[PDB]
Write a protein that binds this ligand. Sequence first.
Ligand SMILES: O=c1ccn([C@@H]2O[C@H](COP(=O)(O)OP(=O)(O)O[C@H]3O[C@H](CO)[C@@H](O)[C@H](O)[C@H]3O)[C@@H](O)[C@H]2O)c(=O)[nH]1
Length: 436
Amino acid sequence: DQPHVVVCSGAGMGHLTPFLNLASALSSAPYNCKVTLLIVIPLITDAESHHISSFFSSHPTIHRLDFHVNLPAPKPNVDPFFLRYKSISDSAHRLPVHLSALSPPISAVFSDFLFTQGLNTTLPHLPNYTFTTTSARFFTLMSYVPHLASSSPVEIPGLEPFPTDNIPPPFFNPEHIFTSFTISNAKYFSLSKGILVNTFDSFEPETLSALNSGDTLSDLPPVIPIGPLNELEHNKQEELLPWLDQQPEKSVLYVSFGNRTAMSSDQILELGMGLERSDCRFIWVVKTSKIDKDDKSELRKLFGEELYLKLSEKGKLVKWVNQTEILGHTAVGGFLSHCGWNSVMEAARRGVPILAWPQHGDQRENAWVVEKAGLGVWEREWASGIQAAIVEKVKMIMGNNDLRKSAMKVGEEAKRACDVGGSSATALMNIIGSLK
Ligand SMILES: O=c1ccn([C@@H]2O[C@H](COP(=O)(O)OP(=O)(O)O[C@H]3O[C@H](CO)[C@@H](O)[C@H](O)[C@H]3O)[C@@H](O)[C@H]2O)c(=O)[nH]1
């Protein structure tokens, strides 16, 4: 009968939502698995807590397993999420006693890469699919981190070189907190049954081809595209939908840099000045210390009254959205994004052209993948002239006919890939089929 599988989620929105999406897909037709979704508690952000609660309330047949990992003490000059990621990696070896109590006996685990060493050493007989949450392109660099020595381009044989400006500088320091648990877990990728990627074959064909053909990266297991993951339905309907319903097709710019972006007040002000001068309407997710989603006093102070009024007449300034509901609306014509990979793939699914302003980490390589696929354009020096960058490029994404067509073609292939019979759905069905 039906396989029982465990999905091991990590921490942070970007490392949570693809695991929720996978859990949801595997619990439903045509996969029809019994799914236990492991959640690391405590959670760090309220966004995480509400997303998880809402998920389990709307997926009653999915079983929740709370995996308690003590919060690490803060340390000066160490990022709190990196400290949390390290605590998860350090705790993964404790999973045997927790997974052994599950019934019926589990057939497989699908896990964040932070769990790799713990799962592949203490549960070596349990098939572990390491589900990376970044692009296939950046995953290859991460898997190569244990072999780094430099300020030269990194050339993984068989792949286009990685320029220095696209590699997080900490990757060259094995003692950096992030590099340390990247190295310790990448060293056990070879014991994973496969690497799953939230991507699709026609989106990263050169990378996937190299990895698979053998070799580049001899010792990796098969690297399997399973994206885009079919979207969740959300408990509460998106509050901006009736307004979006009133806008012409493809006339609204969606703007979001996510929870992990550190834009200063000066940068936010310049961005607002640029938007006020553009012709399109917008939805802009702006971070505010006030907890009430409706309190705009901080924005009024930041922009000043005249600018704020003009901005609020032309678009929506909000604290949070259901992103997939926004990107799925016919009124949204473009996406100014930091290119966090979940956001890239949600835009790919809907064929939404991207204006890429990457901030840190994998985002520059993600932006390059987006530009190479024809899904968007990457503004390499956005931070050196924010207002001008906005005025010139927003008009272009919103109207350029060639980019609109190439982005639409990405959307058609992305939809095809996750539909019944799609290349990604076929790959996932074959994984589940191999458990029966
Ligand atoms: O207002 C919001 C903002 C985000 N989301 C959702 O949250 C997820 C965000 O994903 P993403 O943008 O990828 O996550 P980030 O947390 O911003 O990004 C982190 O995680 C990604 C995946 O590993 C990386 O590519 C980034 O570099 C990293 O910083 C998506 O599913 C979005 O739909 C919303 O629903 N509403």
